[PDB]
Amino acid sequence: MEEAYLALGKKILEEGHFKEDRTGTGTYSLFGYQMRFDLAKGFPLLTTKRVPFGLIKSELLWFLKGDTNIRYLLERNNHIWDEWAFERYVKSADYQGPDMTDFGHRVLQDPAFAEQYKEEHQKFCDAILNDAEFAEKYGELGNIYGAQWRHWETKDGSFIDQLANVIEMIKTNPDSRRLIVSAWNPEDVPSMALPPCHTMFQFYVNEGKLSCQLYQRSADVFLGVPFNIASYALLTHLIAHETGLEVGEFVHTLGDAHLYQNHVEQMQEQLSREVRSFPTLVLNPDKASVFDFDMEDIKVEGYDPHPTIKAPIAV
Amino acid sequence: MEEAYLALGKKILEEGHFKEDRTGTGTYSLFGYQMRFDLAKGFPLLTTKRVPFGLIKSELLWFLKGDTNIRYLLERNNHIWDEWAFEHQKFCDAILNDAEFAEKYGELGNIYGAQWRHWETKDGSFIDQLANVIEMIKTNPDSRRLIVSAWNPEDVPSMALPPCHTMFQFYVNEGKLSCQLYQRSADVFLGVPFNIASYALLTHLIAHETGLEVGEFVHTLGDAHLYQNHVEQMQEQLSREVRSFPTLVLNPDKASVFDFDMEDIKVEGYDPHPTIKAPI
Numbered sequence: 095m096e097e098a099y100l101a102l103g104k105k106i107l108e109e110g111h112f113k114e115d116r117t118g119t120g121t122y123s124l125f126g127y128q129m130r131f132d133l134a135k136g137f138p139l140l141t142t143k144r145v146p147f148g149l150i151k152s153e154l155l156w157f158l159k160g161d162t163n164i165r166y167l168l169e170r171n172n173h174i175w176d177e178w179a180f181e182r183y184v185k186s187a188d189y190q191g192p193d194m195t196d197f198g199h200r201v202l203q204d205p206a207f208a209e210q211y212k213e214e215h216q217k218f219c220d221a222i223l224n225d226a227e228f229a230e231k232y233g234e235l236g237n238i239y240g241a242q243w244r245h246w247e248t249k250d251g252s253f254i255d256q257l258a259n260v261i262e263m264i265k266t267n268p269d270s271r272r273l274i275v276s277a278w279n280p281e282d283v284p285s286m287a288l289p290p291c292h293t294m295f296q297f298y299v300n301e302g303k304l305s306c307q308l309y310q311r312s313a314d315v316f317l318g319v320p321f322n323i324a325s326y327a328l329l330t331h332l333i334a335h336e337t338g339l340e341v342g343e344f345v346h347t348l349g350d351a352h353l354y355q356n357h358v359e360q361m362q363e364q365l366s367r368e369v370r371s372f373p374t375l376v377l378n379p380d381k382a383s384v385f386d387f388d389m390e391d392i393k394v395e396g397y398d399p400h401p402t403i404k405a406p407i408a409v
Numbered sequence: 410m411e412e413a414y415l416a417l418g419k420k421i422l423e424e425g426h427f428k429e430d431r432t433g434t435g436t437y438s439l440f441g442y443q444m445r446f447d448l449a450k451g452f453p454l455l456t457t458k459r460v461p462f463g464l465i466k467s468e469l470l471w472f473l474k475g476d477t478n479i480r481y482l483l484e485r486n487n488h489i490w491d492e493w494a495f496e497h498q499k500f501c502d503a504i505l506n507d508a509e510f511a512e513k514y515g516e517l518g519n520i521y522g523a524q525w526r527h528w529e530t531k532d533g534s535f536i537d538q539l540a541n542v543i544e545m546i547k548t549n550p551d552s553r554r555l556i557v558s559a560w561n562p563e564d565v566p567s568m569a570l571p572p573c574h575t576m577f578q579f580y581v582n583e584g585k586l587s588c589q590l591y592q593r594s595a596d597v598f599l600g601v602p603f604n605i606a607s608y609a610l611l612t613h614l615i616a617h618e619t620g621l622e623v624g625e626f627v628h629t630l631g632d633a634h635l636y637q638n639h640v641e642q643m644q645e646q647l648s649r650e651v652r653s654f655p656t657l658v659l660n661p662d663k664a665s666v667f668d669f670d671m672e673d674i675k676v677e678g679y680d681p682h683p684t685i686k687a688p689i
C-alpha cells in the first residue's frame with residue numbers, strides 16, 4: 095500500500111542517522127527494509143505526488159530491449175539518465191565548454207553557472223540525437239541493467255539472456271526456487287556509469303499468481319523508489335501477461351534506504367497529503383511476449399494524483 | 410530477537426501454502442520475509458533448541474579462507490559434504506593420510522569460498538570480492554556498494570547445489586557494522602537456524618578485522634519453506650520458553666580473521682533447550 099512507502103519516508107525522517115555519500119549532497123539513512131504491494135489492489139503509482147509513468151515505461155522498454163545507450167531515451171523525451179552520460183562527456187578529451195566540475199551541486203547555488211550547464215546540456219542532447227558517432231561514444235552507460243538482463247557475457251565468447259530464461263522457467267517450472275535475475279556482475283561493475291541500485295530480483299508462484307521480490311542495495315527514497323516500485327510492478331504485469339498468470343505481491347527489500355538532505359521539505363509536504371485510489375494498469379491483449387510491448391501498448395488509467403513535487407537529482 | 414524466527418515458523422504453520430514437488434516432497438511456503446538481529450543483545454544461536462556451533466565455525470572458516478577442499482573440514486570432524494565427494498572409511502582415511510589423494514578426489518570446485526574469494530573473469534583473471542569489500546569498509550565506510558555475490562548465471566544451470574545464499578551487503582553507521590543477507594530458498598526448521606549463526610559470526614569476524622562494533626544482522630528470505638515432517642518439530646519448538654542469547658568471544662590477540670582457527674571462537678553462557686531431531 096502507499097501507506098507502506100509513506101511510512102518508510104517518515105521513519106527515515108525520524109530515525110535515519112546522517113551519513114556522508116559519494117554524491118556530496120548528504121543523506122539520512124537506514125539499513126534493512128521491506129515493503130509489500132498487493133498488485134491486485136491497484137497499480138502502485140504514487141498518488142500523494144505526480145509520478146511520470148511515461149518515463150517509467152520508456153526506461154522499462156529500454157531495459158527489456160537490452161539497450162544501454164541514452165539515444166532511445168532521449169527520442170521519447172526521457173532525460174532521467176542524462177546526467178551520468180553528461181558527466182562522462184565533460185570528463186572526456188572531446189569536451190570544450192566551460193568547466194563542469196561539480197555541476198550537480200553548482201546549479202543550485204550559482205545562477206549564471208546553471209544557465210551555462212543548461213546550454214551545454216542542450217548541445218549534448220542535440221548531439222546524441224543527431225550525431226551517430228557522438229551518440230555511440232557518449233550516450234553509452236556501460237553494461238547497466240539492460241545489458242545484464244538480455245546479454246550477460248560469458249567466459250567462452252557468448253551471452254546469457256537472463257530475463258528470457260527466467261520467463262520460460264516460470265512457464266514450465268513455476269515452483270523453482272531459482273527464478274532469479276541479477277544485474278550485479280562483478281566483472282562489469284567498474285565499467286558501469288553506476289552499479290545497479292536495484293541489484294537483483296526473484297519470482298514466485300502460488301495458486302496461479304506471480305509474485306516478485308526485488309533486492310535493492312541503495313534506495314533513493316524521494317526520487318528513485320517511486321520509479322522502482324512502478325518499474326518492477328509493470329515488469330510483473332508484463333510477465334504475468336506472457337505467462338498466463340494472475341498478478342501477486344511485489345515485495346520491495348532495501349539495503350541503504352536514504353533520504354537526501356535536500357529532499358526533506360519535499361518528503362514532509364508529501365506526508366501532509368491524503369492518499370487516493372491507485373490507478374489500474376492496461377495492457378494490449380494482442381501482444382504475446384514481454385519483449386513485443388511498445389509505448390502505446392501500456393497505459394495507466396484512473397490516475398488522479400496530487401501535484402508534482404520537484405526535487406534535485408543527486409550527481 | 411529469537412521471537413522473529415519463532416513468529417516466522419508460526420506464520421508458516423498458519424498461512425503457509427502447500428506444494429508438492431516431483432519427488433513427492435511437501436512444504437509450507439511464504440514469499441518475502443525479513444528478520445533482524447541486534448548483535449549487541451547477544452549472539453543468535455537458537456536457545457529454543459540446541460544448535461551445533463562447531464560445524465558452523467568450521468564451515469564459515471572454510472568459506473572465508475577460500476578453501477574448496479574437504480581436508481580442512483575433515484580435520485575438524487565436519488562431514489556435511491562427504492557425499493558429493495564420495496571401504497567408506499578407506500576414502501575418508503586416505504584423504505586424511507595420503508598427501509596427494511585429497512587433491513585428486515576431495516576437491517569440490519565451485520561454491521561459496523571460490524565465489525567469495527575467487528570470481529573468474531572473461532580474460533581468465535580472478536576477483537577477490539570479500540577481500541575487496543574488507544578494504545572498502547576500512548577506507549570508504551559510507552559506501553552503498555559493499556556487496557558480495559554468489560550468483561553467477563553462467564554456472565547455476567550447470568551446478569549440483571546452486572548457492573542458497575545469493576548475495577550479502579555490508580553497511581556502517583556510527584562505528585558499527587551491519588550485514589543484510591538475501592537468501593533465495595530457506596529450510597526454516599533445519600537450515601535457517603544454521604544460517605543465522607553463520608552470517609552473524611561472519612559479521613562479528615569482519616567487524617573485528619576492521620576494528621568496528623557490531624550492529625545488526627538482517628536476514629531476508631525469498632522462498633521460505635517448512636518441510637511437512639518438520640511440522641511436529643516446529644510446533645514442539647514454539648511451546649518452549651525463549652532464553653537469553655549467549656555471548657560470542659573472539660580471541661583479541663589475533664589481529665586478522667584469516668588466521669582464526671576453531672580454538673579462537675568461543676560462545677559463552679549458551680544454555681539451550683534439548684536437541685530436537687528431524688529428517689534432512
Ligand SMILES: CN(Cc1cnc2nc(N)nc(N)c2n1)c1ccc(C(=O)N[C@@H](CCC(=O)O)C(=O)O)cc1
Nearest residue numbers: 146174175288314317318319321403404405407408409
Ligand atoms: C534514472 N533514475 C534511476 C536512478 C539512477 N541513478 C540515481 N541516482 C540517485 N542519486 N538517485 C536516484 N533516484 C537515481 N535513480 C532516475 C533518475 C532521475 C529521476 C528524477 O529526477 N525524477 C524527477 C523528474 C521527472 C521529470 O522529468 O519530470 C521526479 O520528479 O520524479 C528519477 C529516476
